[PDB]
């Protein structure tokens, strides 16, 4: 039972279906993935993906 969450650093509108929109200091919740380069959670009532390059993982 363990569900690391992150940080975006910058923020976005999403514009791309399965993309996860997000702004500066949300806190979105991963328990999915895509690749080594971008993971995959939800946040509020949706889910999507979202590359480490936009976000920092509190709990690695």
């Known amino acids: 039972m363990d ?3 992150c940080r975006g650093l910058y923020d976005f509108e999403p514009e791309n279906q399965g993309e996860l929109g997000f702004k500066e200091g949300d806190i979105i919740t ?3 993935q895509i690749d080594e380069n971008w993971y ?3 946040i ?3 889910s999507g993906f979202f590359p480490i390059n936009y976000v920092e993982v509190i709990v690695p």
Request: charged share 15%; net charge negative; hydrophobic share 15%.
């Open 3 to 5: 569900q690391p969450c």
């Open 30 to 32: 991963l328990t999915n």
């Open 40 to 42: 995959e959670g939800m």
């Open 44 to 46: 509020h009532g949706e």
